């Protein structure tokens, strides 16, 4: 029903980790999944990010939430990232997957 995604913006050095935090915001639905988003900066191009290595997920159920960590970071994660929120609501297939408005990372 609303995606809360935080931080809006975030500026690293080389080697720190960011956070990245999006709650499902309603009364009706469970967060079911989520994917992750980056659009590089400079670039048009959208890709989701497969989960694992330096990239993490964690989740709460209580709070509604999925959380990406990125760890060592580069001067390349600088870019535009996303979480697509999917859905398990009380009654059907219907349409799901909400989006955080984003995070801009730039990274030294």
């Given at each position: 029903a609303r995606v809360d995604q935080t931080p809006r913006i975030a500026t690293k050095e080389t080697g720190e980790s960011l956070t990245i935090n999006c709650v499902l915001?309603?009364?009706?639905?469970?967060?079911d999944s989520t994917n992750w988003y980056r659009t590089k900066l400079g670039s048009t191009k959208e890709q989701t990010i497969s989960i694992g290595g330096r990239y993490s997920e964690t989740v709460d159920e209580g709070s509604n939430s999925a959380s990406l960590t990125i760890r060592d970071?580069?001067?390349?994660?600088s870019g535009t990232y996303k979480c697509k929120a999917y859905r398990r609501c009380?009654?059907?297939?219907?349409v799901g997957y909400k989006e955080g408005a984003g995070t801009v990372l730039t990274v030294k």
């Open positions: 915001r309603d009364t009706a639905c469970a967060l970071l580069r001067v390349e994660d009380a009654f059907n297939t219907g």
